[model samples]
Target: SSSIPMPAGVNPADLAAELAAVVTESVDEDYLLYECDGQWVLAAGVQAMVELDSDELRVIRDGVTRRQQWSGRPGAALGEAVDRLLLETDQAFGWVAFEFGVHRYGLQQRLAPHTPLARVFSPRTRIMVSEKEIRLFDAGIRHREAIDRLLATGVREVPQSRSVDVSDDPSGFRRRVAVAVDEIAAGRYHKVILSRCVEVPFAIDFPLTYRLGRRHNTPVRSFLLQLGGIRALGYSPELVTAVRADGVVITEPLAGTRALGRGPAIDRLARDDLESNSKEIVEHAISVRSSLEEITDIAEPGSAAVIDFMTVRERGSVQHLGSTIRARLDPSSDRMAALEALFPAVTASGIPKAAGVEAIFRLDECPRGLYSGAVVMLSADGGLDAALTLRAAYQVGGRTWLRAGAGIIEESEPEREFEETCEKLSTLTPYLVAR
Candidate 1:
């Protein structure tokens, strides 16, 4: 990363505003802007891309490597490239959409038949924050242009909320839940994560919604990006996977939901209830165990283990039982292969992935699109971070879609599952539904 460091005492928020103002949808072409507690990154303009219908991971690796060798530009910021994956030819940074049955011939086949499978893009310019310093990575001219754009653009305002027409009826959704419970009893699967989507008849204010979500919810990943013609923004609390440079991969799976109450006493009761309930316990264990099994398949011998057991994690409107699992990848293992084994996260999908997916198809009437999928970024140094596409919204064509799901097991109540879905929606509905 080349440094054109901003002066001391420069406010990060002010810096963010300026950069955001200059980055218009059409001008940026394709970009991803992500913000966390202390750092933010913007990757703008695509230099090379890989689009695939199937076998996406392997193709992306080859394409990115090929792009890297094309330049033959020695001393091409290899260290900085690994950190932000700015100009690395072997780095593939992009997203994977969640269409319920697209892979493994599951429900997405019948539900979301037309969804694109995956996309990976190599960005030309990467701007990142390292603690208090702002670093730019790219050609000197492009870097200067970015700084100029930030200086010239006026302060941008947050978008106001708009009245959106939503279609998340209770009767129809509850009916689907009943069917899912029945399937669980019949030995189809131990647990099936059934999802429902709400349709909005207008475009969403992606940036504003993302900003509000960070304040209202505790999220592991927050992002805003435009891919193709689709605008996706969300703060996801679930992490599908995070791989470090040392070959260690970690996954945090969260399951078992309970809505937050008005006061401390009521909140305490809800937490206790979630912990004591056998059904919730079983559901959570299934998710964690499944994740461990996935890591075991690709991990070095005796390296896979549950680092953190069942614990309660609270996010905005709800709390869930969460656990962390970790492993060391074998030298011969494929990075994407390890991820594929855990794709469609267990918390979002269910135990025995294939069976749970089938139940989801039978229960839900629509495709999930990006809901259960993930927003992921891969670095040249084998660093990976991905957010499960939960508590998210997407705008495509003329409609905005929001989706949420509840895990259903034999002990699950259809009515309670329906209510859980409502609670999950509260994460985004307050910002989305017009007052």
Candidate 2:
């Protein structure tokens, strides 16, 4: 089937209406069947209390414009409600889902457990949506203040701190990532990505935000502007995903897992350490295995293969990693289903996701806001694209918040892990902060 063509001169509101109409017509008895044009340009999910055969569409329309309060973990009642809605709704769609708030303990926990049709956990906070198209921010300016403040809060403040070896050949990981990039060039996947994980430990629990205002002072702070937290900052160029008219979805999976490069010689040594390091591969594999299980719910029961290795370049850093499941998306699957199921990719979630999350929760004192959440948009062309909010920041209630985390395996170290976490946080360092 040919994708819907990207239309011109259309308003987003009108596009929404058209989508709603499409949902109303396609909904059937056996399946609720929700669909989005492509990826993150448009988002929709079941509303609480929606019932099959019910004429009323329950739509909650405030996540994109308003600052949603973070609620802690959810209870069984809420889970029941979600399950019920999902079971009853004939179809649903929305631009964004609220799971990244600092207080959303239940929401995040619950979301993590579901078999979403598709999801975007960019781990970077930059995303752009417009009437015509949707785009992602990949390489852009840094958030210096956010980084410095986060680093300054280090081990002295947060108690839990540890680092895991991520690969046998940190350098070889780069090689694998490169191969995927080659495949992308060869049209094997829609996008190939590479990412690196680092851990941070604070002596005390922190709000997980940086300085209250703007100053463009950190390495990873550029995302703050893209996140609508800083108006002074304008549009950013790098994108993770984009949706054009006619259901064309463009995604850039440039997340690299290893670089450990500070200098050429040190970079080579670090790469050597990683390539021959059994401990790193164990930690990495475990993280991937667990993440895949959590997202798919198939556990070790279902069989999946590694897509391809690839490399990515983010702002000032370069990273390398093993295979990434990159693709233009198979048209056969409901686009919406693919969108929901694709989220919270294991690479971002850490392996045995539960163990990794628990370990981080037990160790880190700072609260991660939309840091690991999704940044989504509904396009005028009736397409969608959402990026993970990993290296992201937002200012709400007159305060700024940011999140940074890393995966740890058996051979992980506390101190070096500390620096890696710093590096991770550095991706969103703020421009300025006041004591």
Q: How does each model score on lDDT?
A: 0.67, 0.32
TM, every model = 0.83, 0.43
Compared with the true structure, what per-residue lDDT tens digits does model 1 show for residues 230-294? 77777787888887789998889998898873478988999999989887788788788788888
For model 1, the stretches where C-alpha displacement exceeds 4 angstroms are: 1-18, 26-28, 35-38, 54-91, 99-115, 139-143, 146-167, 433-435
Cα RMSD, model 2: 16.7
Instruction: Name the top TM-score candidate.
Output: 1
What lDDT score is found at residue 167 in candidate 2? 26
